[PDB]
Amino acid sequence: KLSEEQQHIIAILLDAHHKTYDPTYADFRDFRPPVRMSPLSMLPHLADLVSYSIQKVIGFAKMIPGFRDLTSDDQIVLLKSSAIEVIMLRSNQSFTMDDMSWDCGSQDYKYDVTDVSKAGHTLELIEPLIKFQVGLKKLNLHEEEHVLLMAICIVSPDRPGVQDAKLVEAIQDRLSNTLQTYIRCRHPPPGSHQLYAKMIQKLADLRSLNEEHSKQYRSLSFQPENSMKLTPLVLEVFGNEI
């Protein structure tokens, strides 16, 4: 069974997610509006969407048990490299297989393959991204596993630039062990079949998605007129080599 610390960690991560993920998407009204007619007409809306999502990712990250014991530099490294990955992961909540799209409450805020294209990205990212979303959906994760996965994703010792790798590893292992134990104690067969390994694999998928996103973002942002359409937080986190 799950220890009291493990139950504690789960309760903390659930609450941290509830406080940083608004399932009514009510804040989407504050973003630059979506335009669907290239011009890259979806870049101002989606730039704001990602920018907003970074802030929420940070808010969640601060509440991860053990995260606060890291230096602020390492906090920075972990967030800079993981943010795109956790946005893709957390976006699974809005993703729907009915039509292979992210459904955020309304037609304006429903984003399909071509909306993402209209933000400067190609099928080289979008196709594996959608495939990720599908493979992830099909795990039918408990909300508890989802929040653990986002946490394990953030606290990853192999991230480039990490100083106190040992301490990051110890923090991850504690979450990892909470995940494995949660799966054995609270996820019934058959759904729990090789579930941990399938979740770790999704983190491997995210590393490729991350790399590909970095290449396309690099190319997108070099062009000063695209960079003009981004936010200052997106430039800071993803890069501003323009």
């Binding site: 802030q55 940070i58 808010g59 601060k62 602020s72 906090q75 920075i76 967030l79 800079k80 200052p232 937080l233 800071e236 986190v237």
Partner: peptide
Amino acid sequence: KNHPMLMNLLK
């Protein structure tokens, strides 16, 4: 380096 906004949001 220089990540003032990320830093601020962190504490």
